[PDB]
């Protein structure tokens, strides 16, 4: 074997503690770059002129933030969608003022996470598994692409990408509601059903399997010792589990086929979250939530408010206040 052959064998080796693989050859350096830049910026980066109006926003810990308020702040609105790597700046001081770290981090992250997804396909193939775990992960990945890349593209600026921080996230969400009425969008509604449903079914499945564990232990020990890693037999009685759930609702609302059950557990949150991601990704092109503002009118023509109109008042409050120094003209068009 020549050197390249040995290298390919090591890269694709099923015996490495962490699998590398060809997707890993890209994933490893890109995620390390994103992580290192993120950590340094979150601690020590100076204020960033996010909205391109020479009004720098402090994101870092050393510049007066805590964990909750801190962020890596999006690149300047003056940049827009222009590619702003370190080498396009006259200096690191300029790069920092303009939000260069944000671009570096999100682009390495998105590439690295895309390769994380490929790597999941890759290892499944090396291990003789079925291939679709990566398809499930495509849901959160799609959501990350939506807020870091697709939304910026549609709006014309990475200044409108989700900030890399806890309060910055909430900011993004509130502005998004003002500008898209996302709550009233059926794809976000499907998202909510996906995550509420996912959490419900997580709890349900967990509770039902736990409820039907076969007695293998005494009272003075954890029931978990009743299962041994790699044992051939099932550790719970699925017939008992089904007999309970079928009676809780009615016989036919209960899964007796564990394969069908586990497919449903995969599909429900994954499909819901694909829709969430498509919500953000289509609201990126300003096809927005339902608008029933003044939809109900009386015999004379008086507006009869509904809860939609109350939502609209809250949205207006967000709209008129956000980026209070950035707008010179009456309409917020991006």
């Amino acid at each position: 074997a020549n050197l390249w052959e040995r290298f390919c064998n090591w890269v694709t080796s099923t015996d490495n503690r962490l699998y590398v693989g060809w997707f890993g050859v890209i994933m490893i350096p890109t995620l390390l770059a994103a992580t290192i830049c993120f950590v340094i910026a979150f601690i020590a980066a100076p204020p960033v002129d996010i909205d391109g109006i020479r009004e720098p926003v402090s994101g870092s810990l050393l510049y007066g933030n805590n964990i909750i308020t801190g962020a890596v702040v999006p690149s300047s609105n003056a940049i827009g969608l222009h590619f702003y790597p370190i080498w396009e700046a006259a200096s690191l001081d300029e790069w920092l003022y303009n939000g260069g770290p944000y671009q570096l981090i999100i682009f390495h992250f998105l590439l690295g996470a895309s390769c994380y997804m490929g790597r999941q396909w890759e290892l499944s193939y090396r291990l003789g598994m079925r291939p679709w775990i990566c398809v499930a992960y495509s849901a959160p990945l799609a959501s990350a692409f939506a807020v870091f890349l697709i939304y910026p593209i549609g709006q014309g600026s990475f200044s409108d990408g989700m900030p890399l921080g806890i309060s910055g996230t909430f900011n993004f969400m509130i502005v998004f509601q003002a500008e898209h009425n996302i709550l009233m969008h059926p794809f976000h509604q499907l998202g909510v059903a996906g995550v509420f449903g996912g959490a419900l079914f997580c709890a349900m499945h967990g509770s039902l399997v736990t409820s039907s564990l076969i007695r293998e232990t005494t009272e003075t020990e954890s029931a978990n010792y009743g299962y041994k890693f790699g044992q051939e037999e099932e550790t719970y009685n699925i017939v008992a589990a089904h007999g309970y759930f079928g009676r809780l609702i009615f016989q036919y609302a209960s899964f007796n086929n564990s394969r069908s059950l586990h497919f449903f557990l995969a599909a429900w949150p994954v499909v819901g979250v694909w829709f969430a991601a498509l919500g953000i990704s289509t609201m990126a092109f300003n096809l927005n939530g339902f608008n029933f503002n003044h939809s109900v009118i009386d015999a004379k023509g008086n507006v009869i408010n509904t809860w939609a109109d109350i939502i609209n008042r809250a949205n207006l409050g967000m709209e008129v206040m956000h980026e209070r120094n950035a707008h010179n003209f009456p309409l917020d068009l991006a």
């Binding site: 849901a139 900011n171 299962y227 089904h242 009615f250 007796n256 339902f290 008129v320 009456p330």
Partner: protein, 341 residues
Amino acid sequence: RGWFDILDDWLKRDRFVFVGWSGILLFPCAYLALGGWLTGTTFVTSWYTHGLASSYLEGCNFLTVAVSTPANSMGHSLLLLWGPEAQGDFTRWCQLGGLWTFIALHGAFGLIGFMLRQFEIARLVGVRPYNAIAFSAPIAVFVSVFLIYPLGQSSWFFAPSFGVAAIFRFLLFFQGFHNWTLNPFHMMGVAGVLGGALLCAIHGATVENTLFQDGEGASTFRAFNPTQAEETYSMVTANRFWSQIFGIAFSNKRWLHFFMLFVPVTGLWMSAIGVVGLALNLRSYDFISQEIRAAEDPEFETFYTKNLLLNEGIRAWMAPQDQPHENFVFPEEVLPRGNAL
């Protein structure tokens, strides 16, 4: 022999819809809660309580219909049909928001009924009652949000109204008035929900992609038998995959499934605690150190101070229509607004 045992026999017969002693509480309350909601959203107004149209009859759609809370002047009145407010007049009762307390209270007792059903069925079939235990989370949420919260506030008016858009309004109110996103109890709630959805997805996907070939079909669902003794998927292969991908993996199926109970259940319980604080306006609204710095230093700006400006917008712009009992008149000149917008 003996009417009680005879009744017990009949209540616990294996029929299509199990009844049980629990059913005596559950079925009427759940039916009335659901029927209350359908009735109100189809036919009933919120004109006299909120100045709002809220039914299909008035022209609302599925997203905008609601059964709305009673007027603030009702305080925390039980608002019983026969009580001193409606005085047995069904029409007036509807107009005063009586269907809101109807649905909330019947809904609460129905939830008690459902959890009792979970206990009753588990006892009869002979399984451990973890499903009932898990259900404590939905109960903590309902009780904290629909009962405790308005009970700490001025009146039921400020409870959530039962409707799609109405619930959205509740979210936005909590942002603008409570800064609820900043609350670490809500944050833990978010973690449990998103973490629960994550676990649901990843576990479902993992099982489906580590299945043993137990048939010749390309569609693999047929190759499972409810009575089979063998695991349908490989725990050993699953463990190796995740150990190599993510660094850690489950090795114990019982721990795995208990953790799936633990995460979303704990998350919901944490969010309930935060809402209990919000009943009292005991918010995580501010960071004092941030405010002292910002007040003294007009160049200091973070995402935290940016969000408070949004909140101030929300309060001033939504309050006069959202809180009509206050009779707010905010002249145009006092409304907070940035440039141009």
